[PDB]
Amino acid sequence: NLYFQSMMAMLEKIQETAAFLKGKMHTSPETAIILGTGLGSLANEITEKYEIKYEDIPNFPVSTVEGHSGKLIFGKLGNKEIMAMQGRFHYYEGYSMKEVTFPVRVMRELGIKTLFVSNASGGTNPEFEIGDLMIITDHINYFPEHPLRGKNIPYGPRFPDMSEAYDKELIRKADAIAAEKGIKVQHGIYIGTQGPTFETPAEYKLFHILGADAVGMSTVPEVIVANHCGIKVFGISVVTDLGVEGKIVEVSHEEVQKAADAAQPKMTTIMRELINRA
Amino acid sequence: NLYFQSMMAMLEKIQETAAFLKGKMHTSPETAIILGTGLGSLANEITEKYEIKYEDIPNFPVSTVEGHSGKLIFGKLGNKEIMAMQGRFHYYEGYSMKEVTFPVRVMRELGIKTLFVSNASGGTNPEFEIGDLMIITDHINYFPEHPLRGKNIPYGPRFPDMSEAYDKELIRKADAIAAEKGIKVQHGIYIGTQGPTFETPAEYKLFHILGADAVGMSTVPEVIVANHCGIKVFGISVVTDLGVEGKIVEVSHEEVQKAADAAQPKMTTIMRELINRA
Amino acid sequence: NLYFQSMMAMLEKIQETAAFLKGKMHTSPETAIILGTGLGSLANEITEKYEIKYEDIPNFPVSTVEGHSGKLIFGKLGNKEIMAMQGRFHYYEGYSMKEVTFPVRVMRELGIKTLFVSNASGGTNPEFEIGDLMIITDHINYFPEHPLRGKNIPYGPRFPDMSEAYDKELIRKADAIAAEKGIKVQHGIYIGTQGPTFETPAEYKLFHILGADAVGMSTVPEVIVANHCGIKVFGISVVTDLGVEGKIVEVSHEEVQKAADAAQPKMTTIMRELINRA
Numbered sequence A, B, C: 001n002l003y004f005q006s007m008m009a010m011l012e013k014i015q016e017t018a019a020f021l022k023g024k025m026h027t028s029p030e031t032a033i034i035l036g037t038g039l040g041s042l043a044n045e046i047t048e049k050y051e052i053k054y055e056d057i058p059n060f061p062v063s064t065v066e067g068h069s070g071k072l073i074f075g076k077l078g079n080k081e082i083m084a085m086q087g088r089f090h091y092y093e094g095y096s097m098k099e100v101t102f103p104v105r106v107m108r109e110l111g112i113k114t115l116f117v118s119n120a121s122g123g124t125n126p127e128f129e130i131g132d133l134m135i136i137t138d139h140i141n142y143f144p145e146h147p148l149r150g151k152n153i154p155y156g157p158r159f160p161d162m163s164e165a166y167d168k169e170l171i172r173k174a175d176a177i178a179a180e181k182g183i184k185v186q187h188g189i190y191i192g193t194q195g196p197t198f199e200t201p202a203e204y205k206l207f208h209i210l211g212a213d214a215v216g217m218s219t220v221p222e223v224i225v226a227n228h229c230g231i232k233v234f235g236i237s238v239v240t241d242l243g244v245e246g247k248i249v250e251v252s253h254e255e256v257q258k259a260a261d262a263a264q265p266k267m268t269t270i271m272r273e274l275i276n277r278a
């Protein structure tokens, strides 16, 4: 009853938004990139660009966080057509997990087959340094709300297997690219937590104990939903501050944005080659 | 005000459903069994059976998960009258914890004094094998919603003690039965998590670090509420897949159901003797 | 839209309640004390006292937990004017985190610059004994709802830094006072969890693994919001029961209250001197 009508209404919104976007587009991208905090300038590398602001898209959330421009960018990255979310949505803004991940449902209907996720994070692995790029090999969902709770959208499984949520072959390829380009990359586990407070030292320590290498407030829900949708996932987390015991200092979102912006060109090189060698 | 009217409305629903069921019943069971995924065929061992479908019961949730038949079964298991929930409800379906546990509140009013809980789970203890029966000696509530939040139903404590949530004497008796019958049993801690995604390898590892031996998406809320109600609890978790580091493979709910169905006869032997020797 | 109107309505309630309280007050306290379970008799040490019951304050929650009297007390502790919350609010009662922490938002508008938080807790550090006072040096937020989710109240940061949530200088001063008075104090990490069940042995063990020294069902949300408000925090947790592996026994809220009441005079000595030497 109520759970069903909720799902029906969501399917209607997905179709209305997807129809709206097809009516605006003149390319057929098969890869999408979600650009997190400070990482929006990847879009300066997109050619033949055109843009649709989130505020103009029916049913779309809007980005309220500083450093999230709030537009969809279409164009070529290297020689392949892509679409990029220049800015994303977070559960701490007040959005439900179904609103946070609504764009991934719409990307499925637009023909996206691969999703690249990026974010700024705090490093809990003591080997990490600010500015490191961490290829995400697995994640921990530490949010209190799961985007798939409720009636199942029937094109994916009621109970998705998550043994390989991040495509192993894309990671192997990204490693090869990074080695050829001489770009240092880390690898590890991202934990997603609601925020919006940065962690206490005890909370950073907790996340280290649980096996996380980097912590942030995004990404996990979009990966879950991409997995449900059958969309392949690659993810890079940019370490923008340290949550390492003995090394914690005051952090600010302003400094996070500057650190992410400084690392963006190396991240974009890897993603551009990953798209273009496939 | 609002929390109170909510409780009042819940008490009204409990009484209306309990009155409905008393009006259909012609036995007085003092033990109830909740049958989880793949475990419904315990009901083929019940004699003098009669059934009430969940869809016909006022205020009852319905089971939407494959492998949950959705009926209450009354009859004798061995020589004692029981009632069995052939199928249960889960928080990942969209039900609130007060809906998930509503049947335990109704069982209190029907005179149930002991609750047996069963489920299918993923094993995180590296000694476990698919098909093992794990007697639940304690649990970890890892769900984001607690069934007792809000105004307290005054026949139980505001703050239940949970030092012995699973009756120690029923575990001792079940161990003795299993030894006499030559049925191998494990013992350990069940962790309940919302789902509906199966765990990533990092999440299985997290649950091992926290001290869990098996993980699933049910059972904990019903045990909490049974404890509040003064109903004694015994629980068996059937290990249907491994979440052990180095041994993880793709899992599916279809294979979970087949593994649980294969273990059901040994589980039922223990429960039948436990009921009949008391 | 909805998140904004929600915030606007909350700002209106904060101002209406703060105006109401200013209209009743005839002192200008700069320190407030939140008194948890069993700790209300600190208010017997306040001189020139006057009281406002929570039920008479517009928009205030009321305390439904035994041992929480439900009034605001104004007067002098030593020679400084203070205000004390004699009783607090908890998420397990059904209150949202914005209701639980509404008094801290109102205290900001009343001119409070320092908040002392007190609570009764279960000890997970094996060195602790019932009746110990634990100065809180850091905390772990294990609640499923964060008081800052949603639109940010613009006088504090979207993303508060939490590297020093508990003022280090107040802890140093409290340690010095305790040493001069010969009062034994512990120091450690408080973890806040929703409740209302006391923890299972497995849950107490989990909290020990995560690095907690004491566990309770309060305090963290108020500290988060005080931090957002720019109000300095000091906190003492009174260990009222043990959640130490091998030493767990049945606990009751009645016994918790008696244990907290027995420790209150030593807690009050430290807080009174901390207020009066500043």
Ligand SMILES: O=c1[nH]cnc2c([C@@H]3N[C@H](CO)[C@@H](O)[C@H]3O)c[nH]c12
Pocket: A037, A065, A090, A119, A120, A121, A122, A123, A195, A198, A199, A215, A216, A217, A218, A240, A241, A243, A252, A253, A256, A257, C159
């Ligand atoms: O140390 C951290 N802890 C949690 N999140 C973040 C972030 C992420 N960037 C934002 C805050 O800078 C926010 O959206 C979060 O997801 C950077 N560093 C950290």
Ligand SMILES: O=c1[nH]cnc2c([C@@H]3N[C@H](CO)[C@@H](O)[C@H]3O)c[nH]c12
Pocket: A159, B037, B065, B090, B119, B120, B121, B122, B123, B195, B198, B199, B215, B216, B217, B218, B240, B241, B243, B252, B253, B256, B257
């Ligand atoms: O490995 C697991 N992780 C989490 N839950 C389950 C289950 C339980 N059975 C269902 C999915 O097969 C679901 O209701 C869950 O509670 C079996 N194996 C696992």
Ligand SMILES: O=c1[nH]cnc2c([C@@H]3N[C@H](CO)[C@@H](O)[C@H]3O)c[nH]c12
Pocket: B159, C037, C065, C090, C119, C120, C121, C122, C123, C195, C198, C199, C215, C216, C217, C218, C240, C241, C243, C252, C253, C256, C257
């Ligand atoms: O062992 C414990 N676990 C969790 N909370 C508490 C408490 C706190 N006091 C109340 C229950 O006695 C409740 O509000 C909780 O915050 C004392 N001991 C414990």
